[PDB]
Ligand binder design. Sequence first.
Ligand SMILES: CC(C)(COP(=O)(O)OP(=O)(O)OC[C@H]1O[C@@H](n2cnc3c(N)ncnc32)[C@H](O)[C@@H]1OP(=O)(O)O)[C@@H](O)C(=O)NCCC(=O)NCCNC(=O)CCC(=O)c1ccccc1C(=O)O
Ligand SMILES: CC(C)(COP(=O)(O)OP(=O)(O)OC[C@H]1O[C@@H](n2cnc3c(N)ncnc32)[C@H](O)[C@@H]1OP(=O)(O)O)[C@@H](O)C(=O)NCCC(=O)NCCNC(=O)CCC(=O)c1ccccc1C(=O)O
Ligand SMILES: CC(C)(COP(=O)(O)OP(=O)(O)OC[C@H]1O[C@@H](n2cnc3c(N)ncnc32)[C@H](O)[C@@H]1OP(=O)(O)O)[C@@H](O)C(=O)NCCC(=O)NCCNC(=O)CCC(=O)c1ccccc1C(=O)O
Ligand SMILES: CC(C)(COP(=O)(O)OP(=O)(O)OC[C@H]1O[C@@H](n2cnc3c(N)ncnc32)[C@H](O)[C@@H]1OP(=O)(O)O)[C@@H](O)C(=O)NCCC(=O)NCCNC(=O)CCC(=O)c1ccccc1C(=O)O
Ligand SMILES: CC(C)(COP(=O)(O)OP(=O)(O)OC[C@H]1O[C@@H](n2cnc3c(N)ncnc32)[C@H](O)[C@@H]1OP(=O)(O)O)[C@@H](O)C(=O)NCCC(=O)NCCNC(=O)CCC(=O)c1ccccc1C(=O)O
Ligand SMILES: [Cl-]
Ligand SMILES: [Cl-]
Ligand SMILES: [Cl-]
Ligand SMILES: [Cl-]
Ligand SMILES: [Cl-]
Ligand SMILES: [Cl-]
Lengths: 281, 281, 281, 281, 281, 281
Amino acid sequence: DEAMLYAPVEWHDCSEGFEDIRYEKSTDGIAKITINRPQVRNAFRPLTVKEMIQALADARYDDNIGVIILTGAGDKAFCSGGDQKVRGDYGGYKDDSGVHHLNVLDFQRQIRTCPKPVVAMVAGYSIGGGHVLHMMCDLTIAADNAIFGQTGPKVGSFDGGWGASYMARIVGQKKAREIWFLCRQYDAKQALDMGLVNTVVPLADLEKETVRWCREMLQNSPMALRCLKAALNADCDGQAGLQELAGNATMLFYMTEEGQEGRNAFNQKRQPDFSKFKRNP
Amino acid sequence: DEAMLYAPVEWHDCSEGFEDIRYEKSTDGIAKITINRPQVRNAFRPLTVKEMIQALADARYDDNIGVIILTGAGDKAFCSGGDQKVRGDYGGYKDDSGVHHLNVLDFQRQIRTCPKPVVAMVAGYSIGGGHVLHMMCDLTIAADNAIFGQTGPKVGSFDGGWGASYMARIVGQKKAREIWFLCRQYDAKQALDMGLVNTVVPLADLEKETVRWCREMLQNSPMALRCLKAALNADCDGQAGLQELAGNATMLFYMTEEGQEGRNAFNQKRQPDFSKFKRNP
Amino acid sequence: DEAMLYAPVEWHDCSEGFEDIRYEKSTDGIAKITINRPQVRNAFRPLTVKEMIQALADARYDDNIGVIILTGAGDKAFCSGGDQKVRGDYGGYKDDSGVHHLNVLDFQRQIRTCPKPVVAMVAGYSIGGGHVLHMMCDLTIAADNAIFGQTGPKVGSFDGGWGASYMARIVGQKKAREIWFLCRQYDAKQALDMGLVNTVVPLADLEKETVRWCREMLQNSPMALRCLKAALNADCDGQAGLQELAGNATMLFYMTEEGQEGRNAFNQKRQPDFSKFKRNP
Amino acid sequence: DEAMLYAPVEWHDCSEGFEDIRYEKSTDGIAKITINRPQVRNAFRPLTVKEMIQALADARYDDNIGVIILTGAGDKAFCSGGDQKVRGDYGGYKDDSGVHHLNVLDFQRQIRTCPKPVVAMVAGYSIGGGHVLHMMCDLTIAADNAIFGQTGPKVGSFDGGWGASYMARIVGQKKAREIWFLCRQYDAKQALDMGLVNTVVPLADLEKETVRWCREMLQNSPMALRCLKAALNADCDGQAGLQELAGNATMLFYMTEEGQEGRNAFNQKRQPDFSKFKRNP
Amino acid sequence: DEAMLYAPVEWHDCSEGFEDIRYEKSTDGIAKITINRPQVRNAFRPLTVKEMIQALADARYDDNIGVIILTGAGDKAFCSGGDQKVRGDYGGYKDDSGVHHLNVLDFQRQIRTCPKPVVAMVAGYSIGGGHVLHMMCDLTIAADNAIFGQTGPKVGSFDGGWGASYMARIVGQKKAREIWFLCRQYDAKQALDMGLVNTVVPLADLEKETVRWCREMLQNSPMALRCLKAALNADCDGQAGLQELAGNATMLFYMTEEGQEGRNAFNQKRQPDFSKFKRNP
Amino acid sequence: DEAMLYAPVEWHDCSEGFEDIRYEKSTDGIAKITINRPQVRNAFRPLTVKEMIQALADARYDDNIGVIILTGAGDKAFCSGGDQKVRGDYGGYKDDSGVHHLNVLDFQRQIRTCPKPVVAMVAGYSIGGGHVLHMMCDLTIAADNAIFGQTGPKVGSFDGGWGASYMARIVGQKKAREIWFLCRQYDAKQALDMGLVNTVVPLADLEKETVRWCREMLQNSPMALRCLKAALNADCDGQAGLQELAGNATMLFYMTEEGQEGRNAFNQKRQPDFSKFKRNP
Ligand SMILES: CC(C)(COP(=O)(O)OP(=O)(O)OC[C@H]1O[C@@H](n2cnc3c(N)ncnc32)[C@H](O)[C@@H]1OP(=O)(O)O)[C@@H](O)C(=O)NCCC(=O)NCCNC(=O)CCC(=O)c1ccccc1C(=O)O
Ligand SMILES: CC(C)(COP(=O)(O)OP(=O)(O)OC[C@H]1O[C@@H](n2cnc3c(N)ncnc32)[C@H](O)[C@@H]1OP(=O)(O)O)[C@@H](O)C(=O)NCCC(=O)NCCNC(=O)CCC(=O)c1ccccc1C(=O)O
Ligand SMILES: CC(C)(COP(=O)(O)OP(=O)(O)OC[C@H]1O[C@@H](n2cnc3c(N)ncnc32)[C@H](O)[C@@H]1OP(=O)(O)O)[C@@H](O)C(=O)NCCC(=O)NCCNC(=O)CCC(=O)c1ccccc1C(=O)O
Ligand SMILES: CC(C)(COP(=O)(O)OP(=O)(O)OC[C@H]1O[C@@H](n2cnc3c(N)ncnc32)[C@H](O)[C@@H]1OP(=O)(O)O)[C@@H](O)C(=O)NCCC(=O)NCCNC(=O)CCC(=O)c1ccccc1C(=O)O
Ligand SMILES: CC(C)(COP(=O)(O)OP(=O)(O)OC[C@H]1O[C@@H](n2cnc3c(N)ncnc32)[C@H](O)[C@@H]1OP(=O)(O)O)[C@@H](O)C(=O)NCCC(=O)NCCNC(=O)CCC(=O)c1ccccc1C(=O)O
Ligand SMILES: [Cl-]
Ligand SMILES: [Cl-]
Ligand SMILES: [Cl-]
Ligand SMILES: [Cl-]
Ligand SMILES: [Cl-]
Ligand SMILES: [Cl-]
């Protein structure tokens, strides 16, 4: 239904109180987080990350939202990683109160455990920490002007966490070592060819196509989506992944009569009677 | 309730067709598989394993059975492992047709994936392949005359699968290397002290205590039990463990109105409407 | 040797007793399992699965068979997954007796642990559970009319087991999330491009090329093939994978003089003497 | 130095705005989170968990805190798990707004990823979700009146995430399956013997001994502790564990001259000169 | 800077004492190990491996070297694997003294744990054990005449270690099973298409391009490069990977004032004072 | 026979060329490496480690040696870890040439990958890096005066590799966190009780009992021993563990006629004929 998928999107502004990002919601259930620091190619300082964390937490708890888009303001950059202008000498990035942070690690975890799909909408540069962020998103929609790469070994940094291992799970070990060791830039076609992004579209149609992809997911079962996301994380995240996968199993079990009987019996101060529930093979 | 836990048990014989084992079921939902080759300390030959497999399959599919006991005939042996008298040169144990088998590997997987708890009831020797068998069982109830250990490096064999890795998940890596490398025998107290068995009871009380443990589990949620068994396997078995765990999540999802709407929609040749189901955080 | 590789194939029917599938063997060592429910696009019901499990067990134990082909009858579908017409409310698919099954999980594990290569021969739709089946097969040969995808989030289901994790080990995490979250369909070239199938051939050439691939494997060491298949599973299946791989090492050890000395000594009531066997570095 | 270790402790309150918990800080760097619903054996409702999350976030960000204690009010209970009185049918526990939560999962991950040691101080009952909470804590100090166990299969629930797998990494797979399948209660001595808690002390000495253990850690390198905690999580949590461990490596790298040259060169818009930094073997 | 990247390279010979290989170093920090047995398509015998290990150890310990190239003499072969003419019956390859070796396993490990990037420069055949060798190298630069493949199942062998699992992490599980099961040969384009090599260049420009890639890495942080290599290994090598990654964290910690205070306090026979180092969030 | 087990041991000196260690061999197949720096409680400097690696390589290749003992000179210390007197600021311990090493990491991997059992014979202190060394050994025989612990967080170091993860696989996650975070010392009984060492014997009986354990293993299959050691590593070491396990499978395959046919056919320039080797199930 292209008429539905390509219908106009009406964004409602929810940016009140944010300084470094914009946060918007569509009537049909898309939340969009936009890094708004185009002057530094949308690099994040600790405040930026803090605000993205708050926005993503809101999206998670808004039961009208089914999908999140992460993007950068303007056409030149999605995100250029940590703001090197505030990178201190004592183990992180300094906020205005002098505290050193590495809070993008919290945001990565939050994207990972979000039960709703998160989509990176990438125009122009997705570089360094900004590159890890697009990789963390479940899907990436790239404009034909998109440019991807890491710079760690050039700028005195590295992401040896999901920035390395998870990258290898997307593009394979040979490509991952190349990306990290040489710190070249890759155009959208190169990214597409290596399986790094899901599709490449003309810059002009970036939001149009991204919104179609979100709407396709919004037609589907939110329960199935969250279970599948956990299951896919589970191939990577050991017990942390089991926590997500089993957690959803618990939720489901709480919705059954057998599970509910355990609760009722406790509340009614009696023994449970699980005999009425047939054992499946 | 001790009166209920220690009530007499009435075994019904279901051994029709078996030559190397006995197979029985209680009215209150316990299936018991007994290796019946005491003349060889209950060593298994390929036929024996084939029968244990058939029995355990029957127990899986009988919706009145909730727990399975595995044990050996007599008081002298649980199982002394592969019957070395029929072990061929061509990579396995010879059946009367001359085919070389290692079908205990199938029995290990079957116990592993059985959605009902399997309890090893050990009197006397649990040795070699027979020792791996008790380990594979979810729980082990040991008589005070029980003796445990491996013999592989002494008799020209080894179990480098669950017989090694899973043993280490039970007794730790130092004890596991000790048990394998030296091939000593360990008595019941030594076994309990290392976490190898769940409890040790006087030989005369062996079945009485095992049935008590079985009955305590039979009071509990069968769904919960199978989910937890899968979850505990999943700490060991990677994607195979995910298959089990996720498979249970799939079963539970099928029992929800959200999952059912998806089926209904397809059968009625219409679009699913999941909008009616609230998204949890 | 194209003459040999493209020689005519001579199928012998072994379907007697099967209601939902065909089962055939070639003189040169190929067993072929064909889902035969074209009226439902080769959707499996619980009987279908039980028969496929019986057929694959037969092929495993037939020492003349070296390779298995799995395919769908006709040219419109390989398999469309679980039969939604018989999917019950109580956690699975109803058989004629009203028992609720998810027995395709058994069949997945059987393909996985089969020591002989299994080849999916896909014409037309490989969808849902039927898509996971082709993925489980070691290799996939696709016709130019082949169509691939999942539908779980559309039809209220999910495979978060090998259907998710193992999919990711084939096409990468970005593609896996796309496939599962959007539930689009993908044509043969799309599947080839993402590494989902091994090759794409004109529909007319489907069996001809599949049989060629089978015959190439049939020239190779059956022992090496099974060790390698276990080794590749072991990158995914944790301790379950070690069981497979170590289990083959045991088989091999049994074929050595050192291994046999262990057995010989036990049978001959003497202490083993391993001094004759040089310690390799 | 026992005089230092057993010095009186001086708690200052930081509970402003909390209804379900108390939150306090000692003058020497210990924070203490106390579940304060002793009338229901310190069962948590969604609000309770939310408050615990806020308190733990505070402790994490307070650089004068080096260690956190988790405990329950009164002598009778540490925590009895999820509050069954507010457990709803729709897959979680209802807050006053009707939303269904499983937010203890967030708290579990927050304890896990906390860079500071978290110590469970257990008096009386640690049961169900309350038992998983003490397990998640790095260390457990138990009073002689402490009682441990799970109840899931009895009350229609299960924790198949860290509550299962991680439990196995503490007590081993045999005890873990016993604990979950039978849902017995275990006294302090039983807990100590299976390795489930670190020490058992007289109830009268619980706080004094817990504070001693805390002070011992407070004498040590905070950086070394966080790295080790991450490293120990990493044996369980796959790529999520790598995120923590590598994250600490990044922090350290940012404190070296080599890392800083990378940053300086970027800010100064010149090529970095890494050649002046000797390559270690 | 292409002028710099494509500048002449000045090799100096360091082959003194080697019989099967050449070993050279450039003034700008590239070490090159060349298998020199072109008469047997650069197959390795145990001495060849021994020599390669010695050269790679020398490269690791030379603080002037930052990158290693592995290659074969001539342009017909990179390496055709183990030398079958000296392959013994007793489980390995015979040296002149009749000891049977599989020492390529040590060389694989040594490439894996080398803190400096290792680059396969492939002209002609990279086959069998020789194909596993290029896979182990972090990157592969292939000439347009390069040919890739395994032969194990044809020549009575298999690499079920990194040869299998790590191959799957490169090309995906479907392509890995194809490569191993059929033992076909793949041209440079096929290899590139499946992600098996990083780039393909004209044969006459093989070294020129390889040296360029090396110089690009040689501009980057050696510390970042070794941490990332370890992090990428860590997604595959479980605890051995943790050893590498954490071992780099230890190295970095030693370079900090906090870590040094621990050493200073010990050497000065006083108690450490870690209180001066602020805790980061 | 106890007469055999407790027979006198004749040590022959092989220490020529060593400065920091002694190296001796028994006539019945035991190699003993003794750290010889009692004046610093047998702390290792880079030369010490280099010597131990040389000694262990020699033991690996001496086909008369079946088991290695690692120990410390005198009765006061096994090993107190890294020599803090030569620990430099630049990420390692300085040799006489000023190079900074962490070469114990090499020795750890060498113990891990040694195909012969390695036994720690511990009298007195096993502390720090010295404690990790005893853990790495397959088994530990402790004297009643033995003391165990880590000191990292006190002395500005950590071993977050095998020092952490592998310790947890020995003593469990709760104890492992205790040991690392508090840096207490533990007597021999405490070590035994937590599963940290295999046995405790009177100091005067240390070598006598250690040699008995050694001789017990020396009676068993060297091949079974090495396969089992690999299999147990494989529960921990991911693909590095697969390499060892599969590597052993390859060695065994080379000893079979099916394997050898592949080699013979290649050497005789003819097609292999594997049809003579029946396919096991
Ligand atoms: C069990 C022992 C210690 C009991 O000793 P006891 O003194 O009480 O009895 P015996 O004096 O030995 O007399 C008992 C009779 O039973 C025979 N017998 C005992 N065990 C076996 C056996 N396993 N196979 C064949 N016969 C057995 C004795 O010979 C005697 O009969 P008679 O000759 O007088 O008529 C003592 O019996 C003992 O040690 N038995 C051997 C224990 C053993 O070594 N088992 C084999 C170890 N290996 C395996 O189990 C294979 C498992 C494996 O590693 C594997 C891994 C992967 C895939 C497949 C496998 C597999 O092989 O299955
Ligand atoms: C395959 C499709 C795309 C082909 O479309 P086409 O246009 O060619 O034909 P149709 O007119 O749509 O269909 C032709 C006839 O076949 C019936 N039919 C087709 N598929 C099924 C099916 N799976 N079940 C029942 N009937 C089917 C149609 O109904 C029609 O017959 P009539 O009704 O007119 O008489 C299109 O057919 C299609 O999309 N089919 C459904 C694909 C699907 O959704 N399959 C279910 C996917 N889910 C699973 O398989 C469950 C797997 C799972 O998650 C799992 C996980 C763990 C453990 C167990 C399981 C498990 O459930 O097994
Ligand atoms: C704790 C017990 C053993 C102590 O018994 P005791 O005799 O000393 O006191 P009682 O008289 O029984 O109780 C005193 C008052 O407190 C109430 N109460 C106690 N526990 C709870 C509770 N958990 N919920 C609600 N109320 C509780 C009693 O009802 C009584 O109040 P009154 O009725 O007199 O007014 C005994 O109290 C006991 O067994 N309690 C239940 C322990 C239990 O079963 N907890 C649930 C275990 N399951 C979970 O926690 C869910 C965790 C989970 O699996 C999960 C997994 C993944 C994601 C989320 C979750 C999750 O659900 O959080
Ligand atoms: C490389 C091929 C395809 C190139 O063919 P081409 O037509 O150009 O040359 P040829 O005429 O075939 O031969 C040229 C001369 O070189 C000899 N030769 C080539 N390769 C080898 C070799 N590997 N060993 C010994 N000799 C070799 C030819 O014999 C000829 O010499 P002449 O007799 O005429 O004088 C083609 O040459 C080819 O296919 N060679 C074999 C490729 C192969 O099968 N290699 C072995 C594969 N197996 C291994 O490498 C073992 C690795 C392993 O799995 C493992 C795993 C764990 C632990 C250890 C190992 C291990 O074994 O190391
Ligand atoms: C062992 C202790 C407890 C014994 O105490 P005791 O009272 O009996 O003897 P002392 O009087 O304290 O000492 C006797 C003489 O020996 C010196 N000495 C003892 N140990 C060392 C040492 N490790 N380094 C240098 N000197 C040592 C004493 O100084 C004294 O000599 P004098 O100067 O007075 O003559 C006690 O001695 C003790 O606590 N020693 C320190 C234990 C320790 O902290 N070891 C270091 C722990 N860290 C490591 O091992 C690094 C390992 C690591 O984490 C790592 C990870 C990854 C990669 C590499 C590494 C690595 O660093 O290698
Ligand atoms: Cl970067
Ligand atoms: Cl055994
Ligand atoms: Cl599906
Ligand atoms: Cl519970
Ligand atoms: Cl090969
Ligand atoms: Cl230490």
